[PDB]
Amino acid sequence: KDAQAIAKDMYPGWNLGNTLEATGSGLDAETSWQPTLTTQQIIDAVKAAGFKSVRIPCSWDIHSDSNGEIDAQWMARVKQVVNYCINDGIYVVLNDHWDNGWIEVLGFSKSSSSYQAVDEATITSKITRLKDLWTQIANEFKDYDEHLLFAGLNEPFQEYSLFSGHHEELTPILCRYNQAFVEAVRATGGNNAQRTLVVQGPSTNINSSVNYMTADKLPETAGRLMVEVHYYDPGQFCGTFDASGDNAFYFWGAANHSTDHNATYGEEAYMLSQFGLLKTAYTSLGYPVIIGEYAALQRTISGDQNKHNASVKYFYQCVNEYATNNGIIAFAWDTNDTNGLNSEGGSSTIIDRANSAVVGNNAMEGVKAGVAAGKWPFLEHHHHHH
Numbered sequence: 570k571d572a573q574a575i576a577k578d579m580y581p582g583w584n585l586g587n588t589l590e591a592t593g594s595g596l597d598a599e600t601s602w603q604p605t606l607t608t609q610q611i612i613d614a615v616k617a618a619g620f621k622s623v624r625i626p627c628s629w630d631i632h633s634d635s636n637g638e639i640d641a642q643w644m645a646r647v648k649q650v651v652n653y654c655i656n657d658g659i660y661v662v663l664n665d666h667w668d669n670g671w672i673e674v675l676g677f678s679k680s681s682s683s684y685q686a687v688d689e690a691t692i693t694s695k696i697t698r699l700k701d702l703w704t705q706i707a708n709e710f711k712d713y714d715e716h717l718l719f720a721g722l723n724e725p726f727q728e729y730s731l732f733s734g735h736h737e738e739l740t741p742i743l744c745r746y747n748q749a750f751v752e753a754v755r756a757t758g759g760n761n762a763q764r765t766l767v768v769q770g771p772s773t774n775i776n777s778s779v780n781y782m783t784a785d786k787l788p789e790t791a792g793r794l795m796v797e798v799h800y801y802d803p804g805q806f807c808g809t810f811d812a813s814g815d816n817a818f819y820f821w822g823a824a825n826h827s828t829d830h831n832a833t834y835g836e837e838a839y840m841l842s843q844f845g846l847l848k849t850a851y852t853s854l855g856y857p858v859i860i861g862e863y864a865a866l867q868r869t870i871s872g873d874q875n876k877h878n879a880s881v882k883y884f885y886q887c888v889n890e891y892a893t894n895n896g897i898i899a900f901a902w903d904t905n906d907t908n909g910l911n912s913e914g915g916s917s918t919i920i921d922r923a924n925s926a927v928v929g930n931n932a933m934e935g936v937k938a939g940v941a942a943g944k945w946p947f948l949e950h951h952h953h954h955h
């Protein structure tokens with residue numbers, strides 16, 4: 570099955586966040602940034618909630634020896650986790666995540682403390698390391714069917730203090746890295762030649778992607794390729810900045826404004842406009858898009874808790890409705906922080922992994938409602954049964 574054929578069956582998505590991407594050196598990294606060892610039962614609960622795909626952020630460079638070889642015991646554990654999903658018919662998007670910045674930062678600056686432009690020696694060295702890693706991953710997973718997708722990077726040059734204002738300059742470098750990932754995977758043949766691969770836009774940012782990373786710059790023609798962006802607007806509601814205290818947003822959507830802490834931008838029309846840009850640039854050209862991460866903070870607040878809860882629901886509804894309508898699959902960012910739900914600061918957690926159950930009910934009702942209201946667009950060249 571090709572990218573269009575799988576895409577229509579992939580929504581909605583969910584992330585195994587703060588799990589296999591944690592930057593620890595051992596298997597114990599899995600429970601370093603969140604408490605719960607992954608099990609089949611937990612994945613079963615993700616499926617039972619209604620998710621059809623799981624993005625598995627994963628670190629690999631941090632799990633490698635000095636010769637670049639990925640620890641065999643780490644590889645085997647990642648495979649077990651992937652298998653929990655495949656056992657359930659869940660689509661998996663397996664990435665190489667921030668991974669201590671080895672390419673996400675140092676592929677684009679020679680310094681982590683200030684912007685220092687990279688040169689050809691840097692770029693070619695990062696290409697080779699990227700291909701090394703992805704050769705190892707691809708070969709381990711070669712006999713996996715179309716349920717397994719690979720995503721080469723995470724959020725290339727997203728680090729604002731280093732890279733803001735350098736997107737035009739850096740996007741050609743990212744194109745080279747995306748191409749190197751695809752080349753390495755495809756070379757391993759077998760199911761890897763037919764697998765759908767996911768390449769990331771500049772800073773996983775919609776505006777920069779549709780500007781600088783037009784479809785003609787992608788490493789393959791349409792068929793077995795998707796494009797990934799992330800979506801965290803407005804940050805004070807979603808949790809990326811100024812997201813607690815007086816600047817925070819608790820209420821989102823006009824129907825949901827209250828006494829204070831109202832969103833002042835980034836509401837439904839903004840979201841729809843942004844997702845439309847992705848339709849124009851990518852999905853209308855046969856490249857399905859994944860919103861590989863999105864979230865809203867579910868909080869406990871002193872003010873109108875019902876209106877906050879409704880805002881969380883409505884945000885998840887809008888993301889998933891509008892994504893579906895535009896040929897986009899959205900993946901909820903979920904780090905298994907149940908405690909934060911019981912504070913003003915909030916949490917984006919939906920699944921209480923320790924109890925294999927949904928705890929973020931507003932968010933999850935919103936996911937379900939949004940997917941039900943959406944209408945996936947089909948881009949076909951032959952008849953399908955439908």
Ligand SMILES: OC[C@H]1O[C@@H](O[C@H]2[C@@H](OC[C@H]3O[C@@H](O[C@H]4[C@H](O)[C@@H](O)[C@@H](O)O[C@@H]4CO)[C@H](O)[C@@H](O)[C@@H]3O[C@@H]3O[C@H](CO[C@H]4OC[C@@H](O)[C@H](O)[C@H]4O)[C@@H](O[C@@H]4O[C@H](CO[C@H]5OC[C@@H](O)[C@H](O)[C@H]5O)[C@@H](O)[C@H](O)[C@H]4O)[C@H](O)[C@H]3O)OC[C@@H](O)[C@@H]2O)[C@H](O)[C@@H](O)[C@H]1O
Binds near residue numbers: 862
């Ligand atoms: O050790 C990590 C390293 O991180 C660098 O930052 C990069 C790294 O961020 C990790 C956060 O990821 C974020 O999701 C990303 C997502 O991966 C991206 O794709 C993109 O979308 O952006 C988002 C946002 O950055 C997660 O949502 C976020 O939780 C991750 O943060 C790590 O969280 C661990 C778990 O704690 C969190 O959830 C549990 C809650 O109860 C906590 O409230 C909440 O913080 C943290 O591990 C825990 O660490 C504490 C000790 O640290 C704490 O106290 C000292 C402070 O300095 C620390 O900031 C604070 O966290 C332990 O006691 C506990 O046992 C342990 O579980 C972990 O520290 C934290 O980083 O990857 C994404 C990149 O974009 C980031 O640049 C930092 O730059 C580097 O300095 C270093 O911290």
Ligand SMILES: OC[C@H]1O[C@@H](O)[C@H](O)[C@@H](O)[C@@H]1O[C@@H]1O[C@H](CO[C@H]2OC[C@@H](O)[C@H](O)[C@H]2O)[C@@H](O[C@@H]2O[C@H](CO[C@H]3OC[C@@H](O)[C@H](O)[C@H]3O)[C@@H](O)[C@H](O)[C@H]2O)[C@H](O)[C@H]1O
Binds near residue numbers: 874878930
């Ligand atoms: O009623 C207000 C307040 O009154 C005090 O007198 C009392 O001590 C407080 O408990 C109470 O605050 C609510 O507390 C409940 C939990 O209550 C139990 O534990 C504490 C005891 O003191 C109570 O007697 C017990 O019944 C909170 O409910 C929990 O809320 C979380 C988080 O909810 C949010 O995130 C998930 C989302 O789906 C929700 O809609 C959203 O509100 C839930 O996961 C949990 O199931 C639920 O028990 C309540 O939020 C406090 O206001």
